[PDB]
Design goal:
Blueprint lengths: L30 H6 L7 H12 L4
The structure holds zinc ion.
């Protein structure tokens, strides 16, 4: 709804054409694409680590 750079993927999604507020483990975008975007207040990986601490479910 409200793109949250602190929490979300940040990467302007070519589907939706808005930042990527899918999730922190955004299925739309590859790892590099999440990392490339400086959306979060921390690195992507470090941020995803927090995601994994919550939603530690990865495919
Ligand atoms: Zn994304």
């Amino acid at each position: 709804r409200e793109f949250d750079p602190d929490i979300h993927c940040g990467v302007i999604d070519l589907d939706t054409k808005k930042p990527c507020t899918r999730s922190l483990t955004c299925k739309t975008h590859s790892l590099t694409q999440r990392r490339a975007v400086q959306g979060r207040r921390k690195r992507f990986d470090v941020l995803l680590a927090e995601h994994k601490n919550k939603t530690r479910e990865k495919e």
